Short mmCIF file of C-alpha atoms (C1' of nucleotides) and ligand atoms in Angstrom, two decimals:
data_model
loop_
_atom_site.label_atom_id
_atom_site.label_comp_id
_atom_site.label_asym_id
_atom_site.label_seq_id
_atom_site.Cartn_x
_atom_site.Cartn_y
_atom_site.Cartn_z
CA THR A 1 42.25 76.70 -10.51
CA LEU A 2 44.46 79.50 -11.82
CA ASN A 3 47.38 77.07 -12.01
CA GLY A 4 45.53 73.79 -12.48
CA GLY A 5 47.79 72.67 -15.31
CA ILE A 6 50.89 73.00 -13.11
CA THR A 7 49.32 71.40 -10.03
CA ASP A 8 48.01 68.52 -12.15
CA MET A 9 51.51 67.97 -13.56
CA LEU A 10 53.03 67.98 -10.09
CA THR A 11 50.37 65.60 -8.79
CA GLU A 12 51.06 63.18 -11.65
CA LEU A 13 54.79 63.34 -10.89
CA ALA A 14 54.10 62.73 -7.20
CA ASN A 15 52.06 59.65 -8.04
CA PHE A 16 54.78 58.34 -10.35
CA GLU A 17 57.40 58.67 -7.63
CA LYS A 18 55.24 56.98 -5.00
CA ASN A 19 53.80 54.21 -7.11
CA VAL A 20 56.59 53.41 -9.59
CA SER A 21 59.86 54.72 -8.13
CA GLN A 22 58.82 53.96 -4.53
CA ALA A 23 60.42 57.30 -3.60
CA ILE A 24 58.15 58.56 -0.81
CA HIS A 25 60.11 61.76 -0.13
CA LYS A 26 59.91 62.77 -3.79
CA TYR A 27 56.18 62.04 -3.64
CA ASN A 28 55.85 64.31 -0.61
CA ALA A 29 58.04 66.99 -2.24
CA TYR A 30 55.86 67.13 -5.36
CA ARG A 31 52.66 67.16 -3.30
CA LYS A 32 53.93 70.03 -1.14
CA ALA A 33 54.86 72.03 -4.24
CA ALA A 34 51.45 71.30 -5.78
CA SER A 35 49.76 72.43 -2.58
CA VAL A 36 51.73 75.69 -2.25
CA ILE A 37 51.02 76.49 -5.91
CA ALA A 38 47.34 75.59 -5.57
CA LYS A 39 46.79 78.33 -3.01
CA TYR A 40 49.01 80.90 -4.77
CA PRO A 41 46.56 83.64 -5.84
CA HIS A 42 48.15 84.59 -9.17
CA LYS A 43 48.41 82.87 -12.54
CA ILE A 44 52.05 81.74 -12.53
CA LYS A 45 54.01 83.17 -15.48
CA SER A 46 57.46 81.60 -14.93
CA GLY A 47 59.38 78.96 -13.02
CA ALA A 48 61.42 81.73 -11.40
CA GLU A 49 58.21 83.18 -9.95
CA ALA A 50 57.21 79.72 -8.71
CA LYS A 51 60.64 79.08 -7.15
CA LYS A 52 59.98 81.98 -4.79
CA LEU A 53 57.37 79.70 -3.10
CA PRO A 54 58.52 77.37 -0.29
CA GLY A 55 58.80 73.80 -1.52
CA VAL A 56 59.40 74.78 -5.15
CA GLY A 57 63.09 74.38 -5.97
CA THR A 58 65.28 74.39 -9.06
CA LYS A 59 64.04 71.13 -10.54
CA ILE A 60 60.33 71.94 -10.25
CA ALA A 61 61.04 75.47 -11.47
CA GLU A 62 62.59 73.99 -14.61
CA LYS A 63 59.60 71.69 -15.12
CA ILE A 64 57.21 74.62 -14.73
CA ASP A 65 59.15 76.51 -17.41
CA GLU A 66 58.86 73.53 -19.77
CA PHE A 67 55.15 73.18 -19.02
CA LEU A 68 54.51 76.89 -19.58
CA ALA A 69 56.40 76.96 -22.87
CA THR A 70 54.89 73.79 -24.34
CA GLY A 71 51.82 72.75 -22.32
CA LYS A 72 53.43 69.35 -21.67
CA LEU A 73 56.24 67.66 -19.78
CA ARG A 74 58.33 65.25 -21.86
CA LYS A 75 59.13 63.29 -18.70
CA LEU A 76 55.42 62.65 -18.10
CA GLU A 77 54.79 61.98 -21.79
CA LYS A 78 57.38 59.19 -21.66
CA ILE A 79 56.06 57.79 -18.37
CA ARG A 80 52.59 57.67 -19.93
CA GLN A 81 53.89 55.60 -22.88
CA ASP A 82 55.69 53.07 -20.63
CA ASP A 83 53.46 50.00 -20.27
CA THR A 84 54.95 48.82 -16.98
CA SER A 85 54.75 52.25 -15.32
CA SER A 86 51.21 52.90 -16.55
CA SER A 87 50.08 49.48 -15.36
CA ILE A 88 51.66 49.85 -11.91
CA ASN A 89 50.04 53.27 -11.54
CA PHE A 90 46.64 51.88 -12.51
CA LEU A 91 46.68 48.95 -10.08
CA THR A 92 47.42 51.25 -7.11
CA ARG A 93 44.03 52.85 -7.72
CA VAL A 94 42.48 49.76 -6.11
CA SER A 95 42.13 50.15 -2.34
CA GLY A 96 44.61 47.83 -0.65
CA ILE A 97 47.00 47.65 -3.62
CA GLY A 98 50.01 49.83 -2.95
CA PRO A 99 53.25 50.27 -4.89
CA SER A 100 54.71 46.94 -3.72
CA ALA A 101 51.67 44.81 -4.53
CA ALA A 102 51.12 46.66 -7.81
CA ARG A 103 54.64 45.92 -9.06
CA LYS A 104 54.38 42.28 -7.96
CA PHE A 105 51.10 41.83 -9.86
CA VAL A 106 52.48 43.50 -12.99
CA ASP A 107 55.54 41.23 -12.76
CA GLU A 108 53.19 38.22 -12.74
CA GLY A 109 51.40 39.52 -15.85
CA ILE A 110 48.41 40.97 -13.96
CA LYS A 111 48.13 44.47 -15.34
CA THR A 112 44.47 45.23 -16.17
CA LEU A 113 41.10 45.28 -14.46
CA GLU A 114 40.09 42.03 -16.22
CA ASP A 115 43.42 40.55 -15.12
CA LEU A 116 42.56 41.35 -11.50
CA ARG A 117 39.06 39.92 -11.73
CA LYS A 118 40.46 36.70 -13.19
CA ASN A 119 43.07 36.48 -10.42
CA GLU A 120 40.79 37.30 -7.50
CA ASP A 121 42.30 34.37 -5.57
CA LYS A 122 45.66 36.18 -5.44
CA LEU A 123 44.13 39.14 -3.55
CA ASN A 124 43.81 39.68 0.17
CA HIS A 125 40.49 40.65 1.76
CA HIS A 126 41.02 44.42 1.56
CA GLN A 127 42.12 44.21 -2.08
CA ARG A 128 39.12 42.03 -2.94
CA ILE A 129 36.71 44.65 -1.58
CA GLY A 130 38.65 47.43 -3.30
CA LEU A 131 38.23 45.57 -6.60
CA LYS A 132 34.53 44.79 -5.99
CA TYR A 133 33.77 48.50 -5.61
CA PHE A 134 36.52 49.92 -7.84
CA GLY A 135 34.07 51.94 -9.93
CA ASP A 136 32.05 53.25 -7.00
CA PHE A 137 35.10 54.30 -4.98
CA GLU A 138 36.22 56.43 -7.95
CA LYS A 139 33.11 58.60 -7.54
CA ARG A 140 32.92 61.69 -5.35
CA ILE A 141 30.17 62.04 -2.74
CA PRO A 142 28.00 65.18 -3.14
CA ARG A 143 27.68 67.09 0.13
CA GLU A 144 23.89 66.57 0.00
CA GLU A 145 24.52 62.83 0.25
CA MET A 146 27.13 63.40 2.94
CA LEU A 147 24.37 65.11 4.96
CA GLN A 148 22.09 62.08 4.55
CA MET A 149 24.93 59.79 5.62
CA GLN A 150 25.65 62.00 8.65
CA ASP A 151 22.00 61.80 9.71
CA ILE A 152 22.06 57.99 9.59
CA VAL A 153 25.35 57.59 11.44
CA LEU A 154 24.52 60.08 14.19
CA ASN A 155 21.04 58.65 14.76
CA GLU A 156 22.16 55.02 14.77
CA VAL A 157 24.96 55.82 17.19
CA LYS A 158 22.39 57.58 19.43
CA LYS A 159 20.28 54.41 19.42
CA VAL A 160 23.22 52.35 20.72
CA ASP A 161 24.08 54.76 23.54
CA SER A 162 23.05 58.39 23.97
CA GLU A 163 26.51 59.15 25.43
CA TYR A 164 28.39 58.50 22.19
CA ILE A 165 29.28 61.62 20.24
CA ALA A 166 29.95 61.15 16.52
CA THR A 167 31.56 63.97 14.53
CA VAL A 168 31.99 63.88 10.76
CA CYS A 169 35.48 65.10 9.90
CA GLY A 170 37.65 65.00 6.80
CA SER A 171 36.81 67.22 3.84
CA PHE A 172 33.19 67.34 5.02
CA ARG A 173 34.15 69.28 8.15
CA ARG A 174 36.30 71.56 5.96
CA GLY A 175 33.10 72.51 4.10
CA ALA A 176 33.83 70.70 0.83
CA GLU A 177 31.02 70.58 -1.74
CA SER A 178 31.93 66.93 -2.32
CA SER A 179 33.94 64.31 -0.44
CA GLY A 180 35.93 61.24 -1.39
CA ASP A 181 34.59 59.30 1.62
CA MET A 182 33.05 59.74 5.07
CA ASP A 183 35.33 60.16 8.11
CA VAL A 184 33.65 59.75 11.51
CA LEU A 185 35.31 60.57 14.83
CA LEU A 186 33.65 58.78 17.73
CA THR A 187 33.85 59.32 21.49
CA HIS A 188 32.24 57.75 24.53
CA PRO A 189 32.81 58.76 28.17
CA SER A 190 33.80 55.19 29.10
CA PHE A 191 36.95 55.42 26.90
CA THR A 192 39.53 57.96 28.06
CA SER A 193 43.30 58.11 28.24
CA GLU A 194 42.92 56.99 31.85
CA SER A 195 40.91 53.81 31.39
CA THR A 196 38.58 51.74 29.24
CA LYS A 197 35.48 51.01 31.33
CA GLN A 198 33.48 49.24 28.59
CA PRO A 199 34.69 46.77 25.95
CA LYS A 200 33.38 46.64 22.37
CA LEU A 201 32.72 50.40 22.22
CA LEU A 202 33.59 50.63 18.51
CA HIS A 203 32.28 47.13 17.72
CA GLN A 204 28.79 47.91 19.01
CA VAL A 205 28.52 50.91 16.69
CA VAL A 206 29.82 48.97 13.67
CA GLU A 207 27.38 46.14 14.39
CA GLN A 208 24.40 48.51 14.67
CA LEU A 209 25.31 50.14 11.33
CA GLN A 210 25.56 46.67 9.78
CA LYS A 211 22.22 45.63 11.26
CA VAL A 212 20.45 48.53 9.51
CA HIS A 213 22.30 47.64 6.28
CA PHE A 214 24.26 50.90 6.19
CA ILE A 215 27.69 49.29 6.52
CA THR A 216 28.00 46.66 3.79
CA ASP A 217 31.65 45.49 3.99
CA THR A 218 34.71 45.69 6.24
CA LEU A 219 38.23 46.43 5.01
CA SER A 220 39.89 46.40 8.44
CA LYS A 221 38.66 46.64 11.99
CA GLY A 222 40.23 46.92 15.42
CA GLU A 223 39.54 48.31 18.88
CA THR A 224 39.82 51.94 17.77
CA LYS A 225 39.69 52.10 13.96
CA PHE A 226 37.18 50.76 11.46
CA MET A 227 37.70 51.02 7.70
CA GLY A 228 34.82 49.85 5.54
CA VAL A 229 32.05 50.33 3.01
CA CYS A 230 28.57 51.83 3.37
CA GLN A 231 25.58 52.70 1.20
CA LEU A 232 22.67 55.10 1.39
CA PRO A 233 19.25 53.45 1.07
CA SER A 234 17.36 54.20 -2.11
CA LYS A 235 13.63 54.50 -2.78
CA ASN A 236 11.29 52.17 -4.66
CA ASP A 237 12.22 51.81 -8.36
CA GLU A 238 15.28 54.07 -7.91
CA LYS A 239 18.81 53.13 -8.94
CA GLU A 240 20.97 52.33 -5.94
CA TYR A 241 23.47 54.85 -4.64
CA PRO A 242 27.14 53.95 -5.15
CA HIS A 243 28.88 52.20 -2.33
CA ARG A 244 31.05 54.60 -0.31
CA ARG A 245 34.15 54.29 1.84
CA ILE A 246 33.65 54.98 5.55
CA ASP A 247 36.27 55.35 8.27
CA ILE A 248 35.40 55.46 11.97
CA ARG A 249 38.00 56.37 14.57
CA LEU A 250 37.29 55.98 18.29
CA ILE A 251 39.39 58.53 20.19
CA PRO A 252 39.76 58.88 23.99
CA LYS A 253 37.14 61.40 25.05
CA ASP A 254 39.60 63.64 26.91
CA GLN A 255 41.71 63.80 23.71
CA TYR A 256 38.90 64.89 21.39
CA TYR A 257 40.52 68.16 20.24
CA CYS A 258 43.77 66.56 19.12
CA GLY A 259 41.66 63.86 17.49
CA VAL A 260 39.38 66.23 15.61
CA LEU A 261 42.35 68.34 14.49
CA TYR A 262 43.95 65.18 13.10
CA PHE A 263 40.79 63.83 11.45
CA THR A 264 39.80 67.18 9.90
CA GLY A 265 43.08 67.44 7.99
CA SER A 266 43.80 67.94 5.19
CA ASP A 267 46.63 65.41 5.08
CA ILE A 268 49.04 68.03 3.74
CA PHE A 269 47.80 70.54 6.33
CA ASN A 270 48.55 68.01 9.09
CA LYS A 271 52.04 67.34 7.73
CA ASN A 272 52.73 71.07 7.56
CA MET A 273 51.37 71.74 11.05
CA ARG A 274 53.20 68.82 12.66
CA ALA A 275 56.42 69.83 10.89
CA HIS A 276 55.98 73.37 12.26
CA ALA A 277 55.33 71.96 15.74
CA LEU A 278 58.67 70.13 15.56
CA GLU A 279 60.45 73.36 14.60
CA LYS A 280 58.75 74.98 17.62
CA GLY A 281 59.78 72.18 19.97
CA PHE A 282 56.57 70.16 20.15
CA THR A 283 55.23 66.95 18.67
CA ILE A 284 51.57 66.51 17.70
CA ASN A 285 49.69 63.28 17.13
CA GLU A 286 45.96 62.52 17.19
CA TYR A 287 46.06 62.19 21.00
CA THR A 288 48.30 64.88 22.47
CA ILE A 289 50.68 67.72 21.91
CA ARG A 290 53.86 67.24 23.91
CA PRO A 291 56.96 69.40 24.38
CA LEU A 292 60.32 68.07 23.25
CA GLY A 293 63.16 68.06 25.77
CA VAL A 294 66.76 69.08 25.17
CA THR A 295 67.42 65.49 24.07
CA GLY A 296 64.48 65.58 21.65
CA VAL A 297 62.37 63.15 23.71
CA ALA A 298 58.66 63.88 24.02
CA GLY A 299 57.52 65.07 27.45
CA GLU A 300 54.13 64.78 29.09
CA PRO A 301 50.92 65.90 27.34
CA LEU A 302 50.10 69.59 27.53
CA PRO A 303 46.60 70.75 28.55
CA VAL A 304 44.31 71.18 25.55
CA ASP A 305 40.75 72.47 25.77
CA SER A 306 40.10 73.52 22.15
CA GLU A 307 41.55 73.10 18.69
CA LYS A 308 42.81 76.67 19.06
CA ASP A 309 44.88 75.71 22.10
CA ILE A 310 47.00 73.54 19.80
CA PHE A 311 47.56 76.38 17.33
CA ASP A 312 48.53 78.69 20.22
CA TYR A 313 51.23 76.30 21.46
CA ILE A 314 53.03 76.35 18.10
CA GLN A 315 52.44 80.11 17.65
CA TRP A 316 50.05 79.80 14.70
CA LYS A 317 46.99 81.95 14.23
CA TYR A 318 43.87 79.82 14.36
CA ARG A 319 42.66 78.48 11.02
CA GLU A 320 39.04 77.44 10.68
CA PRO A 321 38.52 73.99 9.12
CA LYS A 322 37.53 75.50 5.75
CA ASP A 323 40.96 77.14 5.52
CA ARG A 324 42.81 73.85 6.10
CA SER A 325 42.24 72.35 2.63
CA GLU A 326 45.88 72.20 1.61
"C1'" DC B 1 77.06 69.69 1.57
"C1'" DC B 2 73.53 66.78 4.40
"C1'" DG B 3 70.20 65.24 7.45
"C1'" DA B 4 65.43 65.57 7.82
"C1'" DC B 5 61.10 65.06 5.91
"C1'" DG B 6 54.15 63.60 10.74
"C1'" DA B 7 52.29 60.27 13.20
"C1'" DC B 8 50.08 56.04 13.78
"C1'" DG B 9 46.11 51.79 13.36
"C1'" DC B 10 45.31 47.30 11.25
"C1'" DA B 11 46.76 43.28 8.18
"C1'" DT B 12 50.26 40.32 6.96
"C1'" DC B 13 54.53 38.09 7.15
"C1'" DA B 14 59.19 36.29 8.99
"C1'" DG B 15 61.46 34.44 12.69
"C1'" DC B 16 61.30 32.37 17.11
"C1'" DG C 1 51.34 32.21 20.28
"C1'" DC C 2 54.56 36.52 20.50
"C1'" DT C 3 57.60 40.52 18.67
"C1'" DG C 4 59.19 43.37 15.07
"C1'" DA C 5 59.26 44.80 10.21
"C1'" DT C 6 56.67 46.02 6.34
"C1'" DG C 7 52.65 47.45 3.40
"C1'" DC C 8 48.79 50.19 3.11
"C1'" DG C 9 45.73 53.10 4.74
"C1'" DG C 10 43.74 57.52 7.41
"C1'" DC C 11 43.89 62.72 8.12
"C1'" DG D 1 62.98 67.15 -4.45
"C1'" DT D 2 63.54 70.82 -1.11
"C1'" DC D 3 65.51 73.24 2.59
"C1'" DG D 4 67.83 75.30 6.90
"C1'" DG D 5 71.85 75.79 9.09
CL1 LIG E 1 52.25 66.45 -19.79
CL1 LIG E 2 42.84 67.04 23.20
CL1 LIG E 3 50.27 60.20 22.92
MG1 LIG E 4 37.96 61.60 3.85
MG1 LIG E 5 42.17 61.29 1.77
NA1 LIG E 6 61.27 77.95 -3.20
NA1 LIG E 7 45.72 51.49 -3.69
NA1 LIG E 8 38.67 58.40 5.12
#
DNA sequence: CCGACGACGCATCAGC
DNA sequence: GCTGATGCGGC
DNA sequence: GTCGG
């Protein structure tokens, strides 16, 4: 955290642009600059030094100079004092409330946590669950609890069908000492890119986890993606664990490596790697890597038998998951 | 200067 | 009911 | 907001 003041300032600017300005490219620009600075191994002494990094331009260089001279950014100081901006930013912290819903609520006079509770009827299902667990979802998950959660999910999946394979991805797979949520990649031999030989493959797993009272709520659920809420069991007389967000993604079994690359992230790492793929003439999603033709149209999927195969196609040296936390 | 900026699943809505 | 656009979320 | 061409 050599440059934690700068990266915090850039992250706050990113959030302002996404949530208030609804300027998604500015949001991504600030996040990229924050990420490149976060891994820079020197204490930054000037904006000129920072501008040498890719994704830091003139405007962020000037802001870094102001921050270094004064410890503050007047632009952020004024945003912080604006009631409407501060309220919009706050409401987007609820899962299911984005920039559009947050501005609409603020325009209707709903701008605090009590305001939301009072106006529960104006919320959709996802937003209602996000409000119910607002406090819990703000908490990080210690890796020791992530290991307990992994044990439950893998064993309950095994009880449904021994041929499922469940892999915990996200920051957990990158080795993080704490996680914001639990990301589970799921495969089953009956679901490939060639055919689906069993229905309800994801449903059966979700239902088993609900039956043992691990999954407590559902935010959204389809044939291949579940987004919901779970909770570790606690012992007699012990305070309950916080409720936690859980995502489960069923991926065709023959596309596991593209899937686990996607679901390991980080999100900024994925954006950087997919952008590099484009520059190299490929496109990467969670299923395939495909070459681009002269017209720019994606061709047929290329053979992939490891995460490293994907790095090799785009001429990147392999990066272990722990070195992908951008 | 200017186009491009990763890719996509699920919920919700408009329009038919 | 469907299709397509949009919001929000995931990494 | 940044950048490659
Ligand atoms: Cl500040
Ligand atoms: Cl694959
Ligand atoms: Cl595909
Ligand atoms: Mg996660
Ligand atoms: Mg995340
Ligand atoms: Na730069
Ligand atoms: Na939100
Ligand atoms: Na997640």
